[PDB]
Amino acid sequence: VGRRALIVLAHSERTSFNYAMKEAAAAALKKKGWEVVESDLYAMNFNPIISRKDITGKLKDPANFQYPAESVLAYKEGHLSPDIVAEQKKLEAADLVIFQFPLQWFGVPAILKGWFERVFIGEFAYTYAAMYDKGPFRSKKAVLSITTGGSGSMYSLQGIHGDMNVILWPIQSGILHFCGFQVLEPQLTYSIGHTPADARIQILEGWKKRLENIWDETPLYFAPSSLFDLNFQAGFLMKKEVQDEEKNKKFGLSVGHHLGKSIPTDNQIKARK
Amino acid sequence: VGRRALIVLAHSERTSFNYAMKEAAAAALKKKGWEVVESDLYAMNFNPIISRKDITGKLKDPANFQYPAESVLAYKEGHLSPDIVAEQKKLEAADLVIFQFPLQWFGVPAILKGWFERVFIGEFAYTYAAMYDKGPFRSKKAVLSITTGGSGSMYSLQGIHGDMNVILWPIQSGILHFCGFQVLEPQLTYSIGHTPADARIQILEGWKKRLENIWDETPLYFAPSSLFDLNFQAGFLMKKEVQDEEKNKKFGLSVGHHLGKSIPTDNQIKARK
Numbered sequence: 329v330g331r332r333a334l335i336v337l338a339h340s341e342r343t344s345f346n347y348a349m350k351e352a353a354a355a356a357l358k359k360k361g362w363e364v365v366e367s368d369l370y371a372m373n374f375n376p377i378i379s380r381k382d383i384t385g386k387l388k389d390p391a392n393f394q395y396p397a398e399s400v401l402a403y404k405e406g407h408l409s410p411d412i413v414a415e416q417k418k419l420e421a422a423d424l425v426i427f428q429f430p431l432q433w434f435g436v437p438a439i440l441k442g443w444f445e446r447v448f449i450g451e452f453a454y455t456y457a458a459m460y461d462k463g464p465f466r467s468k469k470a471v472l473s474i475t476t477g478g479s480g481s482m483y484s485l486q487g488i489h490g491d492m493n494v495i496l497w498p499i500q501s502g503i504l505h506f507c508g509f510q511v512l513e514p515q516l517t518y519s520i521g522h523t524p525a526d527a528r529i530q531i532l533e534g535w536k537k538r539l540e541n542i543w544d545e546t547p548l549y550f551a552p553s554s555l556f557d558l559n560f561q562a563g564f565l566m567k568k569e570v571q572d573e574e575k576n577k578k579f580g581l582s583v584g585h586h587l588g589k590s591i592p593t594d595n596q597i598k599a600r601k
Numbered sequence: 602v603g604r605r606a607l608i609v610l611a612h613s614e615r616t617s618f619n620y621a622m623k624e625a626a627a628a629a630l631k632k633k634g635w636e637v638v639e640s641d642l643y644a645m646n647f648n649p650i651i652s653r654k655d656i657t658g659k660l661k662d663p664a665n666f667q668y669p670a671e672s673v674l675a676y677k678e679g680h681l682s683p684d685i686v687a688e689q690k691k692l693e694a695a696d697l698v699i700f701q702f703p704l705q706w707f708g709v710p711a712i713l714k715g716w717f718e719r720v721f722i723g724e725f726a727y728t729y730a731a732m733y734d735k736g737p738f739r740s741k742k743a744v745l746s747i748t749t750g751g752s753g754s755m756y757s758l759q760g761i762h763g764d765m766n767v768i769l770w771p772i773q774s775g776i777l778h779f780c781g782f783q784v785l786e787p788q789l790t791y792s793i794g795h796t797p798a799d800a801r802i803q804i805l806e807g808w809k810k811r812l813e814n815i816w817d818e819t820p821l822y823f824a825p826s827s828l829f830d831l832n833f834q835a836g837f838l839m840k841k842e843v844q845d846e847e848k849n850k851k852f853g854l855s856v857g858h859h860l861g862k863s864i865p866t867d868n869q870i871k872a873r874k
């Protein structure tokens with residue numbers, strides 16, 4: 329099970345619904361016996377820009393600086409910027425990780441984007457040899473709690489913005505699952521700006537009720553890595569056997585692995601039934 | 602046609618291939634007669650975090666600060682932070698805009714994400730009543746020149762990362778097109794770290810050759826906003842006539858508007874033939 333949780337909030341105002349959503353989760357989770365630690369990026373005045381300043385010490389190749397390689401070495405030798413190590417320390421301790429934030433330009437705030445870029449250093453958060461389901465955080469579970477200005481109908485299949493499942497994909501699969509995280513259904517609260525005072529209240533109430541049994545929830549589906557030849561030779565492509573068995577299926581495996589066919593309904597919003 | 606171009610670069614190293622790719626474009630476009638203006642976010646030491654400080658003056662509602670409304674007002678009244686405004690002035694002048702950056706966490710660098718969040722202010726970049734094809738930038742064209750550590754096969758329909766067309770969707774449709782931009786085909790150069798010195802030189806040459814006639818290119822396909830009822834009541838949903846006529850189509854309209862069917866091949870990578 330899980331008893332330790334980290335809530336990473338990306339909002340500057342203490343009056344926002346996002347903050348309200350963060351306080352409700354901490355209060356709910358706490359009541360159920362969890363330990364709740366936070367990362368109010370704004371309040372921490374967190375540095376979102378990856379630079380050679382993230383490595384406190386000597387670089388292996390100062391004249392030809394390559395962030396990936398240097399950052400991995402810095403993590404390995406213990407030369408990572410102190411504020412980065414502090415966050416990593418929180419992640420290593422967390423069983424459940426909540427990302428509370430308002431949708432901005434169809435994605436996460438720049439400060440949160442920068443938190444991933446600086447904290448999810450190779451070896452620590454991922455390894456080509458242990459990608460996705462085999463990643464470092466496979467024992468962990470992440471949830472995105474997002475609020476939007478636009479109504480849900482704008483993100484439905486025929487909504488002008490297009491399917492939300494596509495929007496969520498690059499983050500839930502590309503960032504979260506890539507590191508091994510089991511990603512639970514996203515807590516989506518649309519057009520929070522057009523919601524009656526009384527409903528907003530139930531929204532907080534519903535989120536708390538959900539967190540009461542969040543650890544026992546069924547995680548979203550991602551094609552298992554076993555279906556792929558995880559070697560550079562085969563070009564990390566899906567196994568021939570698997571490709572053949574699938575040629576007879578109506579739907580694709582997921583949003584990214586739609587394979588040219590139909591994408592399973594709410595693949596990134598709802599867990600299989 | 603186009604005479605002026607803006608190149609937005611998001612990389613810290615003057616030794617990177619991105620910088621090389623940025624120099625290549627500047628040189629090529631200049632040689633064809635273009636005026637080339639730059640935004641080297643890192644060199645400009647650009648601030649990517651939206652804050653109430655983006656508003657130089659009084660807020661309509663300091664107690665309950667809401668960025669969207671306050672920044673739109675500040676724009677209208679002329680109270681946007683000078684650094685933001687200077688970028689907006691670069692956008693209003695440019696015909697072609699190139700976004701040169703390395704793929705980071707299946708998206709754009711946080712410093713660039715922050716650049717969109719602070720620069721793409723309501724009324725300036727959007728209009729709601731003038732979304733997408735009817736946006737403020739409809740007379741301009743945007744192009745993404747991306748570099749990746751992962752090979753192209755990792756991003757193929759069978760690649761372990763999944764289809765690259767989904768990754769580009771939230772950026773090309775959600776950010777650029779949403780603002781009216783005509784988005785040209787992305788310049789995708791994969792696993793640049795596993796590319797021989799001789800090939801790298803060709804990549805640079807190929808990029809320059811394309812920019813010779815880039816303005817004559819056929820932009821990517823996005824479902825026209827005419828297929829939707831662009832108002833609150835209707836929920837910005839696709840028109841019934843449109844829905845029915847489409848019911849008889851093998852393929853969906855695009856990555857976001859897949860409508861539950863097959864997604865047109867390379868919808869976000871290749872323009873219709």
Ligand SMILES: Cc1cc2nc3c(=O)[nH]c(=O)nc-3n(C[C@H](O)[C@H](O)[C@H](O)COP(=O)(O)OP(=O)(O)OC[C@H]3O[C@@H](n4cnc5c(N)ncnc54)[C@H](O)[C@@H]3O)c2cc1C
Nearest residue numbers: 344345346348430431432433434475476477478528668718
């Ligand atoms: C740069 C930028 C980009 C954006 N991009 C997009 C996009 O791509 N797509 C999109 O759809 N939207 C977008 N938005 C809009 C954004 O998603 C919404 O403005 C945001 O989610 C609104 O929620 P909030 O919590 O931030 O704050 P608020 O607007 O404050 O709203 C919370 C509401 O709940 C009330 N409230 C606060 N606390 C409580 C409480 N404890 N109990 C009950 N009620 C409470 C408040 O009074 C308020 O009315 C963008 C905004 C910005 C600034």
Ligand SMILES: Cc1cc2nc3c(=O)[nH]c(=O)nc-3n(C[C@H](O)[C@H](O)[C@H](O)COP(=O)(O)OP(=O)(O)OC[C@H]3O[C@@H](n4cnc5c(N)ncnc54)[C@H](O)[C@@H]3O)c2cc1C
Nearest residue numbers: 395445617618619621703704705706707748749750751801
């Ligand atoms: C936080 C983070 C997240 C990332 N996330 C992802 C991801 O999601 N997916 C993914 O695939 N990758 C990812 N990457 C990898 C990243 O995309 C690559 O490391 C980057 O694109 C490599 O290109 P570069 O230009 O930055 O720099 P460099 O690695 O320096 O490589 C450029 C190469 O070209 C050479 N070169 C330089 N100038 C010239 C010139 N003028 N002519 C010829 N050769 C030249 C250099 O010597 C070098 O070998 C991530 C990296 C970071 C730091």
Ligand SMILES: CC1=C(C)C(=O)C(C)=C(C)C1=O
Nearest residue numbers: 476477478479519521522669
């Ligand atoms: C998100 C959003 C919605 C849904 C609106 O109705 C209006 C008026 C604005 C400005 C806005 O930005």
Ligand SMILES: CC1=C(C)C(=O)C(C)=C(C)C1=O
Nearest residue numbers: 477478669721722723727729
């Ligand atoms: C912040 C913001 C901007 C700038 C817009 O252009 C639109 C349409 C929405 C919803 C929004 O919430």
